Amino acid sequence: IRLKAFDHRLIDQSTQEIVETAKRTGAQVRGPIPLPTRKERFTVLISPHVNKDARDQYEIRTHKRVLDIVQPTDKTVDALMKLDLAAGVEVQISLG
Template structure:
């Protein structure tokens, strides 16, 4: 009796543009639909915001300020698969859009 263990891969995606992030997740899931996966799940993480306050004129008006913010959108793709499949080779060959940062974690 053979017991097959399932391997797990987590891909963490980050981007300033949420549309690029969604299209990258869709591209990864379409690429992995070819193989026989046990499960593929997407987890949406909270969006982090950085807010910067800048004086409009540093020498005169202290009351005149501008606020800028940067939003970082994050997703995690969790993939359960059989270790015999070449999933890692497929993931490294995927060409994602520029502006999407991703990390592949094996467990």
């Protein structure tokens, strides 16, 4: 189970719905392994009339998470794979 999604508050609250949801069905899903902040620095110019001093600053992230089903039989990671998404998560899975 390798993932590709948005932020610090919708993939961690969707891999709450992966470990327990496929552990109750008989097999075992290991714990969530940390993968930190994506550190990407940007530059703009925010002045109405042009003022190279008057910049601003931005940043954007992508979280991944490493889970691994020990003996691969969990269909919940693929059947309830749309349960992992609510509005804007597009789930990547890896069966094994």
